[PDB]
Amino acid sequence: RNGRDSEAKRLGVKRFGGESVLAGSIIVRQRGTKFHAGANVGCGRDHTLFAKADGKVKFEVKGPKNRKFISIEAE
Template sequence: MAQKKSGGSSRNGRDSNSKYLGFKKYFGSFIKPGNIILKQKGNIFYSGLNTSLGKDYTIYSLIFGYIFLKKKNKKKIIYVL
């Protein structure tokens, strides 16, 4: 029997599904309670006033309001007012 596979087969035909990370609502946007602002891997952006952090590091709103960003000690904090 032949030791090599035929020339037409491919070994690297796999690809992972996209994770749809990133901002779902942008700064200055009006949002409702429960709306997802950002999906991320790890804590890159931190949740601030009137926002909460999900177990998969998703930041979402707790109130009606507008989205703002603030930098404090090299941390990027997202909050809603």
């Protein structure tokens, strides 16, 4: 009675650390918030992370819970 499946949602990181992006570009597609928005990064209703400014994207770990953050520096 098996045989059912769902179409893959093509999640994952779209832009990796150290590459320039344009404002509004999608950086990470995720179900929850595995990565939290940092500086110049906005979070969508579906927890999508997009660039709010033009620059280089970088990843880092911050906070007491060592949770991962994505930031953008104007470079």
